[PDB]
Design a protein around this nucleic acid. Structure first.
Ligand SMILES: Nc1nc2c(ncn2[C@H]2C[C@H](O)[C@@H](COP(=O)(O)OP(=O)(O)OP(=O)(O)O)O2)c(=O)[nH]1
Ligand SMILES: [Ca+2]
Ligand SMILES: [Ca+2]
Ligand SMILES: [Ca+2]
Length: 343
DNA sequence: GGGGGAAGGATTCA
DNA sequence: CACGGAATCCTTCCCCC
């Protein structure tokens, strides 16, 4: 009953840069996000394995990477490029199933149930998909196969990189008991911790705790999710998913609270955001700010009609005004987010 | 009491 | 010193029948 095949491209941004400049293949490559603030201020979008080996990875400051690997190749993130390559591969996967859910810029779940019997065939289809993607785009990915999206995903995690793996029903039962609950999708450090205090260290433990306390501790939705898995009864279908919001945010040269100093950044964000909107019309706008102490403050508003760029400019100004008046810290970054698209 | 929303923020993942 | 971006969930305050 139902066979899910999850595809996860390998160290995606770095690998795409390798493909576009093979002279890179073989040496450590780090894709970065730089912000004027200073010489090498920014974070690491990601890096290839010939770099992950020494700890350089997503989230750490570019400077830190530089110390560890001073002579590695540091590339500016070219999101737009990775996107179009992503779209191409996404098309290429449709050829294998109508039921396709695009999770992110490099993730996708395929429902190959009414498409192929047993696991032995699932596997092959896997290898087939890899080859095709590999030959067509020269991009290696990892394929996870199991009874649902959750374990399909976990599968790939286990099989990374450029791998493939199937978690059979017998194994599922083993992981519901042996797999560290932390390693379960949707469980970050915050929840992980919350779970330990409650004694829960495995997906199974959830079955030995009174709901209401669990629900009370991690929220009902997270509780039902986990319990669901533990009972080997999880079964969310693979559905299409359209964007629900679009935004842009930029880090300023220096901190500030001066409206007239921030406004320019904010307006660049809006202009950029509208271009990205294309033909979509938003009913809601939020102004998101990152404070000096790396905290995130936001203020929004929904209109009974769509928002025009003019409308956005003036309304974004008030929300920034509101933020300032309601939060004493200097603002480090400023952005906008449009949502609730008409239709 | 409880439905229907909006707003501000928490948590997670890429 | 820690960047862009986006979804989902949760708490809370409201209006109101
Ligand atoms: N800007 C930014 N982008 C990120 C971050 N994390 C991931 N990404 C982007 C670039 C990654 O290549 C892409 C896929 O993330 P994964 O979590 O799949 O990492 P990646 O595919 O690079 O390596 P992998 O082989 O999956 O371990 O998402 C992040 O922290 N900041
Ligand atoms: Ca990946
Ligand atoms: Ca991914
Ligand atoms: Ca985890």
């Amino acid at each position: 009953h139902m066979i899910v095949l999850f595809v996860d491209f390998d160290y995606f941004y770095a690998q795409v840069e390798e493909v576009l400049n093979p002279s890179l293949k073989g040496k450590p490559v780090v894709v970065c996000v730089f912000s004027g603030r200073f010489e090498d201020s920014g974070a690491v979008a990601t890096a290839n394995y010939e770099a992950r080996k020494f700890g350089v990875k997503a989230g750490i400051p570019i400077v830190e990477a530089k110390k560890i690997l001073p002579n590695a190749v540091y590339l500016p993130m070219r999101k737009e490029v990775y996107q179009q390559v992503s779209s191409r591969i996404m098309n290429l996967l449709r050829e294998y199933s109508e039921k396709i859910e695009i999770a992110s810029i490099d993730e996708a779940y395929l429902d190959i149930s009414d498409k192929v019997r047993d696991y032995r065939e699932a596997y092959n289809l896997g290898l087939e998909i890899k080859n095709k993607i590999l030959e067509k785009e020269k991009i290696t990915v990892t394929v996870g196969i199991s009874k649902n999206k959750v374990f399909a995903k976990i599968a790939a995690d286990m099989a990374k990189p450029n791998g493939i793996k199937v978690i059979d029903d017998e194994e599922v039962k083993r992981l519901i008991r042996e797999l560290d609950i932390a390693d379960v999708p949707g469980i970050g450090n915050i929840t992980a911790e919350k779970l330990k205090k409650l004694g829960i260290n495995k997906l199974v433990d959830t079955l030995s705790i009174e709901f209401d306390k669990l629900k009370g501790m991690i929220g009902e939705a997270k509780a039902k999710y986990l319990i669901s898995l533990a009972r080997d009864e999880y079964n969310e279908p693979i559905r299409t998913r359209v964007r629900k919001s679009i935004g842009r945010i930029v880090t300023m040269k220096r901190n500030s609270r001066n409206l007239e100093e921030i406004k320019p950044y904010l307006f660049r964000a809006i202009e950029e955001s509208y271009y990205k909107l294309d033909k979509r019309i938003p009913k809601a706008i939020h102004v998101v700010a990152v404070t000096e102490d790396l905290d995130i403050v936001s203020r929004g508003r929904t209109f009974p009609h769509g928002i025009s760029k003019e409308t956005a400019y003036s309304e974004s100004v008030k929300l920034l005004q509101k933020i300032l008046e309601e939060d004493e810290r200097k603002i480090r970054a400023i952005g906008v987010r449009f949502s609730k698209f008409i239709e």
